[PDB]
Subunit: 114 residues, 3 copies
């Protein structure tokens, strides 16, 4: 799975340890081994949410399967939780787009997952 967070919070506000915490929490939530989890955090962005420049985040989570209505509600609770507690971003200023990828449409290590 791959999780990306783009945010206007400055880099100095992202705690040491945050990529590793995301990695573990995501391995647990998706049930995938942490070796297959990739995480990307992009701070200091020029962005607005509802017109406002208060702390916000635009995120995505791509996974081959493990995406669906109930799982996505559970991921959002987890990930909004983490963004609130670690980056002090309000959950109503977070979007997370979920993508259930076909294994044939994900390249890795010179091939695809199909």
């Amino acid at each position: 799975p791959m999780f990306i967070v783009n945010t206007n919070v400055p880099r100095a506000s992202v705690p040491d340890g945050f990529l590793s915490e995301l990695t573990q929490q995501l391995a647990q939530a998706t049930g995938k081994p942490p070796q297959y989890i990739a995480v990307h955090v992009v701070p200091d962005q020029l962005m607005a949410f509802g017109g406002s420049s208060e702390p916000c985040a635009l995120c995505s989570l791509h996974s081959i399967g493990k995406i669906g209505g109930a799982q996505n509600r559970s991921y959002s609770k987890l990930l909004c939780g983490l963004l609130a507690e670690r980056l002090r971003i309000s959950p109503d200023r977070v979007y997370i787009n979920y993508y259930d990828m076909n294994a044939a449409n994900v390249g890795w290590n010179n091939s695809t997952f199909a």
Copy 2:
């Protein structure tokens, strides 16, 4: 809705008010409430369009609904118009990918829109 622009135009060439202008104009073109519109501008990027490093932009508009053949033409006209006028990027060096998101696949406020 979430609109993202990545461009090789430098930050100093992004005029004050640009994020607000996008928010406002997208609210109107899409008909959706502006409190839900997020915008994100990423300047100074290392990019090429057609092999050329002349100003260009690669963009995404994601929304729950309001995505379709006629509507996307209207957004393309609007958004190429703003990138030409404000960032001096030629419309034929702009790509915009449109995504009609399922509500179950967008997290917000600890849950999803489902």
Copy 3:
């Protein structure tokens, strides 16, 4: 087609000519003219792959058609090869998401490709 690579390798490690090499080789792999290929390299990113931050890349290739099981295997071998040779990124720390876009969902030059 549009190819984006996000990587933690520093900008000074991206060799001169790399965006042109990606442009040329993708034009060949996809069969589309290079005038229509866009590429975007994002170095110096805060990322982890499998819990750690050795060189890695998270990529996307969007194309109108020319996306499918065999083609994507070939694109993955081509793009992992380039990232390994040119950026010193191991193929097993690369993910590439492939997206077959509908023409009506790609804006360009004030309209869409529909």
